[model samples]
Target: MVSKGEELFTGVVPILVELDGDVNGHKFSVSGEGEGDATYGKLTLKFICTTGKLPVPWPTLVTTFVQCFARYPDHMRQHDFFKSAMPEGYVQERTIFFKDDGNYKTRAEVKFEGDTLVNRIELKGIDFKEDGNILGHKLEYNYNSHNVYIMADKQKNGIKVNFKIRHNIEDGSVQLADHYQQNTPIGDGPVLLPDNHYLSYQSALSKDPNEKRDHMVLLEFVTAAGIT
Candidate 1:
């Protein structure tokens, strides 16, 4: 059941959208092109991985990576992969509950604040404790990926998405200030990874090496209006 396909508003309606996925310490960005009327669109989501440093115990060294910009640079950007990382991505803080049944992901809260245009997402844990994060020992990590927005002509796609984010054992910032280093994502669409975590024929790959994107960042996506 479909109409002439024409309802789409970028700067005028509330078209709820989100990027439902995760990364380790890397980040992403997005751009889009649509054939008008909210149908047949091309979305390009670019991800930038960072140079993961070794873990250490230091007050000045400990950092809660929030965005992709320059903050507490991770030369210095080091921590245990498993303890603070997950298959999803890297988190700022996390608590593991070893139970009799099985190691459950535990109960976490996905809070959405604000209305209409911008929404703030907060993933809070219930009984997470504080531990001295040092070396291969880490407890919890909060995740943040920065902001994401939807562009419609101000205005309106099947939605074609291309992800250009990756990582590995070696190969990192060609220089020292590559946005890919300690990067965060800013664009439309969700922040996720590829199934292969490698490369495709077209070279669309998004990964964060040994550890997935774990660090969290502020997420802000725009609003839209569409009708069928």
Candidate 2:
């Protein structure tokens, strides 16, 4: 049983704004929702940015996509879906179904490369349909800064998503616990707004059309106290 406030706080809400911009030359548009709360232990949201017909690198982009959606380790351990996906000693953690389309089964696996761990996911029973991989080594959880940094690639054309957690304060400023202190800016400013429950900022450089270089940045915030 959930109250009206609870439903509004946890349920998916429409994105207040849809932004259209271009990263380099690749035109793109962003739209999505902000929902859920840290109090309920499910603080996250989604973003769907559509781009022009660029020669997108499917494998890397897929991996980046998955990396952006994974739940925290503590949160992942509690779900049966993740539990089944977890390796003998390892742990586990898509979008695409954004259209409210038909149903499809999913399968995820884990593998290690040196000290780096990766999560590989695919549609069930489909080998050629490789969904993506979550780069475990590229994730940085900084409670001090009250933020998490997840990156897809560190090379030339790379993508990174920063999850900045906000405290339930009047101004919605970050509240670091204990000995934690703030760090450097994740990127340049015009810092996105409506800081509330959480904030997500993603930036990526397109690798398509080899010669036509393009880049994109997406910033979004979520409110858990119900829509205003």
Candidate 3:
């Protein structure tokens, strides 16, 4: 069973598959291998974009799984994991409740209209506001030298976020670095840190000397289930 601290659980790996395509167009494809937890083995993802946009708030897929482990520690052995589906051509919205308590603290929604793919998410008290667009950009993921890298490029400027997950099959601690960037004219750019007041408040309290010089900061979350 997983807990708030200590060794908790292990062998948790989550993967993301980002694709770029046009509105009402057929040019959809995988963005990269996508990010994954440390224990995740190499794998390939294949999917068609069709007329719908891919899901946003990708991080929550990992975060929520973590929260579930913490909220229902004893239930982990009863179930492996959960999954859902959204219709191909319709706007879909759904809420996933906490297991035992049945609380409506998690939500996932996607919609396609005009020429954009929009996604929004709400988890606990955090809301990932809607963001979308159609552009020829891709988000890439890779791991090396004990760090996981997330990056995207459009034009000459790009953004990247990197961190390391400790205890690959045990305690899922993370050592986060201050690597983050934001580039324009692309839908797959890095989610800007300190985008909200709460993050700004945390940034203000950081004593790291580099925090003052850096315009962007990497924000990362890890769960007892081994996802980040």
Candidate 4:
């Protein structure tokens, strides 16, 4: 053991803060964080942001090519990453992989689209302790993606059911939940998704974390999707 420059972090390093406060009706509570402005919306305390699940989408998916590292164990594969964190009308439609004990990979299925968010998505995946009563939803960070991007390019119908949420959706502060395949976690009051499909819960990259990645999303549905 040595402490000659004091550095230690085998994993877990995600910090992109900028959360302002206001809006408690659609339900969001934040009083501290970083940055300012809503990227496009021009904030005057309307306050919104996204990406804390940290799958990619940080600095646009992963674009850290030597932001600076004087031998502190370098990073992003020592100044080489990928995709440069693709955003802006995003469309990485499909990418799936999962294996165990036969070349060994473990659970991955990355899919996305926002071709102007006419919205279509519903993903319920599993990898850890067979959680029962399958209920996990309620991310609902702060629904004002500029009226959810005009309700994701919605044209007709009162058919507005959206958790088509993920990543920065063009930095609109994207967030919405309910549709992780549920039975009831914090929700037991009128629900009918699958006929009202528009879901969330996105993960990619590079899949690694198993054997309890913070208990692997708290066993999916039983963390009750965000217990609030």
Number of the predicted model whose TM-score against the real structure is largest: 2
Off by over 4 Å in 2: 1-96, 124-201, 208-228
Please give, for residues 1-228, the per-residue lDDT of candidate 4 as tens digits: 322111111222121212211111121121211111111111111112232232212212111100101111222121110011111111212111112200101111111132111111222233311211111221222222211111211232112322222323334543222211111112122211112212122222222244222111100000001111
Pick the lDDT winner.
2
Residue ranges of candidate 4 with Cα displaced over 4 Å: 1-11, 24-83, 86-228
TM-score per candidate, in order? 0.18, 0.23, 0.20, 0.16
Model 3 / residue 220 / CA error / Å = 5.6
- Number of backbone-clashing residue pairs for each candidate, in the order shown: 44, 1, 0, 5
Per-residue lDDT of 1-228 in model 2, one digit per residue for the tens? 432222222323222223343322334453433332323333232334445432222221222221212222332222112112211212122212211112112333332223222333333211111222111111111212233333322241222333323222223433221111111112232211221222233232223234233322222221122113
Answer with 1 or 3, whichever has the higher lDDT. 3
Order of the predicted models by lDDT, top scorer first: 2, 3, 1, 4
Query: Which ten-residue region of model 1 has the weakest summed lDDT?
Result: 174-183
Better of 1 and 4 by TM-score: 1
Worst 10 residues of 4 by lDDT: 218-227
Alpha-carbon runs more than 4 Å astray in model 3: 1-9, 12-20, 26-30, 38-74, 83-228
Which is superior by TM-score, 1 or 3?
A: 3
Name the lDDT of candidate 2. Answer: 0.26
Clashing pairs in 2: 23-215
Candidate 1 stretches with Cα past 4 Å from truth are 1-6, 9-38, 41-43, 46-117, 128-228
RMSD of 1: 18.4
